[PDB]
Design an enzyme around this catalytic site. Structure first.
Site, PDB file in Angstrom:
ATOM      1  N   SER A  21       0.751  -1.096   0.041  1.00  0.00           N
ATOM      2  CA  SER A  21      -0.148  -0.018  -0.029  1.00  0.00           C
ATOM      3  C   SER A  21       0.758   1.362  -0.070  1.00  0.00           C
ATOM      4  CB  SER A  21      -0.970   0.026   1.379  1.00  0.00           C
ATOM      5  OG  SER A  21      -1.770  -0.809   1.208  1.00  0.00           O
ATOM      6  N   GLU A  46      -1.424  -1.006  -4.245  1.00  0.00           N
ATOM      7  CA  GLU A  46      -2.634  -0.285  -3.527  1.00  0.00           C
ATOM      8  C   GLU A  46      -2.750   1.145  -3.269  1.00  0.00           C
ATOM      9  OE1 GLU A  46      -5.856  -1.497  -0.653  1.00  0.00           O
ATOM     10  OE2 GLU A  46      -4.368  -0.963   0.544  1.00  0.00           O
ATOM     11  N   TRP A  47      -3.158   2.139  -3.657  1.00  0.00           N
ATOM     12  CA  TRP A  47      -3.146   3.433  -3.281  1.00  0.00           C
ATOM     13  C   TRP A  47      -4.103   3.829  -2.104  1.00  0.00           C
ATOM     14  CZ3 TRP A  47      -5.133   8.431  -6.048  1.00  0.00           C
ATOM     15  CH2 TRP A  47      -4.912   9.439  -5.385  1.00  0.00           C
ATOM     16  N   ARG A  48      -3.542   4.129  -1.165  1.00  0.00           N
ATOM     17  CA  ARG A  48      -4.504   4.105   0.095  1.00  0.00           C
ATOM     18  C   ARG A  48      -4.818   5.779   0.096  1.00  0.00           C
ATOM     19  NH1 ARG A  48      -4.891   0.900   5.027  1.00  0.00           N
ATOM     20  NH2 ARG A  48      -6.120   3.082   5.574  1.00  0.00           N
ATOM     21  N   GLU A  86     -13.979   1.415   9.038  1.00  0.00           N
ATOM     22  CA  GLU A  86     -13.229   0.145   8.817  1.00  0.00           C
ATOM     23  C   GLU A  86     -11.637   0.368   9.037  1.00  0.00           C
ATOM     24  OE1 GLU A  86     -14.781  -2.418   6.163  1.00  0.00           O
ATOM     25  OE2 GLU A  86     -16.880  -1.758   6.196  1.00  0.00           O
ATOM     26  N   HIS A 143     -14.062  -5.187   7.167  1.00  0.00           N
ATOM     27  CA  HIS A 143     -12.979  -5.168   8.349  1.00  0.00           C
ATOM     28  C   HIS A 143     -13.750  -5.258   9.527  1.00  0.00           C
ATOM     29  CE1 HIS A 143     -11.619  -3.321   4.643  1.00  0.00           C
ATOM     30  NE2 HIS A 143     -10.342  -3.877   4.805  1.00  0.00           N
ATOM     31  N   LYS A 170     -13.029 -10.008   0.121  1.00  0.00           N
ATOM     32  CA  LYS A 170     -12.146  -9.677   0.929  1.00  0.00           C
ATOM     33  C   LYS A 170     -12.405  -9.495   2.396  1.00  0.00           C
ATOM     34  CE  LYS A 170      -7.938  -6.618   1.675  1.00  0.00           C
ATOM     35  NZ  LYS A 170      -7.994  -5.263   1.613  1.00  0.00           N
ATOM     36  N   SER A 232       0.392  -0.498   6.490  1.00  0.00           N
ATOM     37  CA  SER A 232      -0.720   0.261   6.307  1.00  0.00           C
ATOM     38  C   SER A 232      -1.826  -0.385   7.370  1.00  0.00           C
ATOM     39  CB  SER A 232      -0.972   0.046   4.799  1.00  0.00           C
ATOM     40  OG  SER A 232      -1.631  -1.073   4.370  1.00  0.00           O
TER      41      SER A 232
HETATM   42  C1  LIG Z   1      -6.891  -3.599   4.059  1.00  0.00           C
HETATM   43  C2  LIG Z   1      -5.675  -4.658   3.920  1.00  0.00           C
HETATM   44  C3  LIG Z   1      -4.980  -4.449   4.722  1.00  0.00           C
HETATM   45  C4  LIG Z   1      -4.089  -5.299   5.838  1.00  0.00           C
HETATM   46  O1  LIG Z   1      -3.509  -6.019   5.417  1.00  0.00           O
HETATM   47  O2  LIG Z   1      -4.595  -5.627   6.867  1.00  0.00           O
HETATM   48  C5  LIG Z   1      -4.523  -3.143   5.019  1.00  0.00           C
HETATM   49  C6  LIG Z   1      -5.101  -2.440   3.502  1.00  0.00           C
HETATM   50  O3  LIG Z   1      -4.291  -1.145   3.062  1.00  0.00           O
HETATM   51  C7  LIG Z   1      -6.463  -2.471   3.469  1.00  0.00           C
HETATM   52  O4  LIG Z   1      -6.739  -2.280   2.034  1.00  0.00           O
END
Ligand SMILES: *[C@H]1C=C(C(=O)[O-])C[C@H](O)[C@H]1O
Ligand SMILES: *[C@H]1C=C(C(=O)[O-])C[C@H](O)[C@H]1O
Lengths: 252, 252
Positions: A21, A46-48, A86, A143, A170, A232
């Site tokens: 990320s 992945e861009w956060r 989340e 999450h 996910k 991240s």
């Molecule tokens: C969810 C995945 C995450 C982690 O591995 O626990 C953090 C990530 O940046 C989110 O997209």
């Protein structure tokens, strides 16, 4: 089950793919992080977007997305606004969340987006079809940063994401104990064995759940998160370390 | 819990210890293999006596132990005759196996012995007390090379081993599926949190059970087996690889 291809990758077959990320607060930040990420080895970037301070400006959001894409044109780019509920950094309205993802989809700069399942069925369903109409793949996520739901609860969520058309379901949960880590691994196998028809990603966060980032080739998680310099989410380990362990398990 | 100190090694604390098995047919291969192993990095050497073809002679058995003991005087030495019903190379009578373990203890060449639980209760207990009167520690063990018993049965075998005075209860089982590997991990963690008052060693064999060889610091297994050139049972991996993974989990 099924596989997903983005760029030259196939997700859902072989060794779990490594996601990292990128996080920067403003444009100049993104630009430095994009140059340093170029020298690391990972499958998907992945861009956060939730760490970015200029999220009310479409102009700024797309300029940051284009600096990333320029730097790394051949890596699948996953656009993720992670909401504060989340685990993310910021709270936006639901409308503003959907406008940022649409902008991302129409831009042509992104290969996938993340859509949080609990955003609302009708909102997620309409964005999924808009995405698919532009050949953008949807990672649908959920999450729990304070606890681990039962295995039963976790498989239903994952099945709910499949029913809603996610290309990749996910789930990430926080263990309160070592048994919570085994519950996540059991829900993963259960989904992968009885219900999945596409790739699924699952992970148990923090120090206790690290094994869950390393055993997706056995128990059925298709991808895992590593850290380039910063994490991240609690639990990610360095991408070179992560990659050594995956190959050891894979060639055993 | 409580720990076992042998030579300068604390078993049941920190990162799992690594055991390698030395296998040789006669005294000159025992010697060769012992010289070769002297260049690897591991915590505990296991001599698998069941591969030695001259077990009819006690004196040839004790000469082979001395050769090993001589090349590696500072490593804990575990003496293990694995019987053929528990996965080993040769059958011997009960009487001869209890006589041989008593000769090992009397010899002063070994630090630990392995005693198979199912040898029989009264015989196994008497042998435990005799080893303890010589400060020799006992790894009590039980193997199922065809299947994985229920979590309940496994906990029950381990607790019966503690009840017989074992210093380190041990179990190895053969997974018939990925769920079986989880059942092994669930038994290990339930023993470690609710019943063990000493270190335990557990493993799921073969390629599906490999994860169990690497996650002992999470789920409660104090030691794990690696291969120096050849494997002593299905699923072991190279000791340098094994050790890289334990380190990353350790410092995760
Ligand atoms: C969810 C995945 C995450 C982690 O591995 O626990 C953090 C990530 O940046 C989110 O997209
Ligand atoms: C029992 C332990 C076995 C394991 O590694 O799977 C093999 C070993 O040599 C026997 O000692």
């Amino acid at each position: 089950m099924k596989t997903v291809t983005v760029k030259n990758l196939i997700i859902g077959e072989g060794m779990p793919k490594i996601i990292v990320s990128l996080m920067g607060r403003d444009i100049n930040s993104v630009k430095a992080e994009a140059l340093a990420y170029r020298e690391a080895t990972f499958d998907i970037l992945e861009w956060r977007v939730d760490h970015f301070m200029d999220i009310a400006s479409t102009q700024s959001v797309l300029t940051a997305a284009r600096v990333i894409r320029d730097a790394m044109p051949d890596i699948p780019l996953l656009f993720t606004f992670r909401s504060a509920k989340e685990g993310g950094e910021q709270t936006i309205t639901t409308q503003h969340y959907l406008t940022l993802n649409r902008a991302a989809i129409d831009s042509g700069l992104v290969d996938m987006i993340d859509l949080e399942l609990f955003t609302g069925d009708a909102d997620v369903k309409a964005t999924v079809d808009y995405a698919h109409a532009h050949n953008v793949y949807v990672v649908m996520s959920n999450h729990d940063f304070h606890q681990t739901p039962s295995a039963e609860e976790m498989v239903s969520r994952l099945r709910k994401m499949q029913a809603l058309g996610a290309d990749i379901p996910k789930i990430a949960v926080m263990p309160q104990s070592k048994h919570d880590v085994l519950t996540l691994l059991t829900a993963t196998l259960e989904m992968q064995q009885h219900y999945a028809d596409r790739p699924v990603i699952t992970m148990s966060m923090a120090k206790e759940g690290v094994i869950s980032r390393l055993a997706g080739e056995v128990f059925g998680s298709a991808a895992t998160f590593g850290a380039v310099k910063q994490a991240s989410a609690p639990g990610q380990i360095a991408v070179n370390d992560l990659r050594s362990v995956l190959m050891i398990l894979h060639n055993a």
